[PDB]
Design a protein around this ligand. Structure first.
Ligand SMILES: *[C@@H]1O[C@H](CO[C@@H]2O[C@@H](C)[C@@H](O)[C@@H](O)[C@@H]2O)[C@@H](O)[C@H](O)[C@H]1NC(C)=O
Lengths: 44, 253, 356
């Protein structure tokens, strides 16, 4: 999962580098019940 | 949230609940973007005509929650606020343009399986994801219907982004580029919308390019909830990113 | 100030009783009286009114009386002044003229040696002038009166925002912790100018009338009425008006008519204005006769509080709707003795509603 940080931890605090990856889903290779609907909306 | 469903545990770990105090009650939704910063809507905190002006000392935030009313031991965290920053050009007199506020936690919150920050979009991700037809997700503990009808647990609803011309024709209010609208069209056969109590919450989208969740918007205003031919409006997070950066740089340390 | 010293004097003389009068109306009455007074008699009156220049003083009231005379179709205000003088009292042209010109007040020769007759003459005149709103001004006219000054004022205006007459319901009113009475309680949840005075320990709510006039209702905290009364002053009033903040309230206010009738000759002396009510009164401006004095100075104020307002009171505000949670509503119930002010640029009315 490629991500380039934009903020500076000195003022932003921690957490940006690993942002948006959920411990109980992405990090466990598990999908929630409706995210497939979102991914399917990108098909055109 | 109208026509949504119960969120799964840890499904929205960046979800933040904003409260007022003495008496303490749900005020709005909000989102965690780091262990010291939280995003919400300006109208959750300030509205001169009603003498509404919630400051750090009048608020508190609960993080890592699922239940709307039950305290969740060793899971939820309560964080006081050090300071709040509302966009100086938040247009409360007309259309709630730039409906955004940043809140700095008095003490950093520890991450867990239930508390984790959401990403803010870079230019490419915003251009790639914030497009008409693509669906994003809104979460909150607000009312289930326009007209006490409150959910037992965090609600979630997926909604499609709407073309700007359609958003504009749907309301008499002057829409700006710092706003976008979302929701299903009368002919799409499905429903859903944010409602009273959901303001300040996040409108997120999952990037298929890096599998990460990005907060594209902040639940802002609407006209009623889930009405035919109407759409909910959201603060365009990317367009206000320069302001976010400025505020964080000036007050973050 | 004088207005508040008088308030306390009246409340002290009649404890646990309704108190209600018009401060500006009494000030006018005194100013008018000073036109025929002299020496120390006049000085006491002026000091009482806390008085720039006399010419300015009278000019102000003359104009003010003209304005309150403009039938503003949104108010019901009847203000009047009149002097009844015994038949034998020779009146000075200058005084009679100044009264009619500056205060639009007439002087009427009266046969006070015929109480019943004079009393009916006076009451009938007042009733006529107040369109029937202020009747039976006098209830007991002491014989051998020399001069009787009467000051009356009726008021009833539409609220800026109406009270749904369908929301008005009879409720319990605690005149005391032991005495309860049923009174029609109006109500309306909405935003009101509100303030919590921790110093005096009372809650103050402002309810505006159609225009620049507003009513202030003060609910002291349990057992603090006396404490609030003692704190009443121009300074305190100014403060309240300045610290007001719009607040969502579930307001419960009694629907009522309140009146107050006072023999000011019995209270003003203790406030410094005594000479004019004695045999050594210097009223050389009114008459060249030596036994001239104000026998009685009657003031009667009547105000009616109802639901009537300008607009239907509702909706509006903005086209968009907030998605933040609705404002928390606080409960403010006036079900025990409260104070009331009605103010424009001046204090039109001040009183204590001990029993609606
Ligand atoms: C919001 O309030 C801020 C602080 O106001 C002051 O402190 C509070 C506790 C009250 O005592 C209030 O009367 C004081 O003025 C202001 O600095 C700020 O301007 C207010 N919001 C805005 C921008 O109007």
């Amino acid at each position: 999962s490629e991500y380039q940080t934009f903020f500076n931890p000195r003022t932003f605090g921690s957490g940006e580098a690993d942002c948006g990856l959920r411990p109980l889903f992405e990090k466990k290779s598990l999908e929630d019940k409706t995210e497939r609907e979102l991914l399917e909306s990108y098909i055109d | 949230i109208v026509e949504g469903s119960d969120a799964e545990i840890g499904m929205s770990p960046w979800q933040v609940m904003l409260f007022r105090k003495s008496p303490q009650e749900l005020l709005c939704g909000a989102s965690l973007i780091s262990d010291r910063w939280v995003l919400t809507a300006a109208h959750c905190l300030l509205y001169p005509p009603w003498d509404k002006n919630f400051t750090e000392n009048d608020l508190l935030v609960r993080i890592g929650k699922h239940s709307r009313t039950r305290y969740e031991r060793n899971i939820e965290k309560i964080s006081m606020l050090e300071k709040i920053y509302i966009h100086p050009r938040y247009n409360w007199r007309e259309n709630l343009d730039r409906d955004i506020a940043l809140m700095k936690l008095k003490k950093p919150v520890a991450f867990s399986d239930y508390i984790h920050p959401v990403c803010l979009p870079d230019r490419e991700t915003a251009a790639s994801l914030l497009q008409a037809g693509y669906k994003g997700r809104v979460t909150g503990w607000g009312n289930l219907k326009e007209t006490k009808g409150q959910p037992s647990v965090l609600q979630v609803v997926n909604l499609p982004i709407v073309e700007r011309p359609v958003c504009k024709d749907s309301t008499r209010i002057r829409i700006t580029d710092n706003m976008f609208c979302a929701g299903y069209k009368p002919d799409e056969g499905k429903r859903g919308d944010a409602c009273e109590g959901d303001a300040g919450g996040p409108f997120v989208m999952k990037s298929p390019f890096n599998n990460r969740w990005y907060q594209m918007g902040i639940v802002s205003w609407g006209e009623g909830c889930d009405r035919d031919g109407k759409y909910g409006f959201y603060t365009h997070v990317f367009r206000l990113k320069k302001w976010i950066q400025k505020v964080i740089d000036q007050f973050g340390e | 100030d004088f207005t508040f010293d008088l308030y306390r004097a009246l409340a002290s003389a009649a404890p646990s009783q309704n108190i209600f009068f018009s401060p500006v109306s009494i000030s006018m009455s005194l100013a008018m009286l000073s036109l025929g007074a002299g020496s120390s008699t006049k000085m006491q009156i002026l000091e009482g009114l806390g008085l720039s220049s006399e010419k300015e003083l009278h000019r102000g009231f003359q104009q003010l009386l003209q304005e309150l005379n403009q039938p503003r179709d949104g108010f019901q205000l009847s203000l009047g002044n009149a002097l009844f003088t015994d038949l034998v009292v020779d009146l000075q042209d200058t005084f009679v003229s100044a009264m009619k010109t500056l205060y639009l007040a007439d002087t009427f020769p009266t046969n006070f040696r015929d109480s019943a007759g004079a009393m009916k003459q006076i009451n009938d005149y007042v009733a006529k002038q107040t369109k029937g709103k202020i009747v039976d001004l006098l209830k007991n006219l002491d014989s051998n009166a020399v001069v009787i000054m009467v000051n009356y004022i009726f008021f009833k205006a539409k609220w800026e925002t109406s009270f749904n007459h369908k929301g008005t319901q009879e409720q319990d009113f605690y005149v005391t912790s032991e005495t309860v009475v049923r009174v029609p309680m109006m109500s309306r949840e909405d935003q009101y100018h509100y303030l919590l005075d921790r110093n005096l320990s009372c809650r103050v709510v402002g309810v505006p009338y159609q225009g620049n006039a507003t009513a202030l209702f003060i609910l002291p905290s349990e057992g603090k009425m006396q404490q609030v009364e003692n704190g009443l002053s121009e300074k305190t009033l100014r403060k309240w008006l300045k610290m007001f903040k719009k607040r969502q309230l579930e307001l419960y206010l009694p629907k009522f008519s309140i009146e107050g009738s006072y023999q000011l000759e019995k209270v003003l002396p203790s406030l410094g204005i005594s000479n004019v009510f004695t045999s050594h009164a210097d009223l050389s401006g009114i008459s060249n006769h030596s036994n001239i004095q104000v026998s009685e100075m009657v003031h009667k104020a009547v105000v009616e509080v109802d639901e009537s307002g300008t607009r239907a009171a509702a909706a509006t505000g903005t086209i968009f709707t907030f998605r933040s949670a609705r404002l928390n509503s606080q409960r403010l119930v006036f079900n025990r003795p409260f104070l009331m002010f009605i103010v424009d640029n001046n204090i039109l009315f001040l009183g204590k509603v001990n029993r609606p």
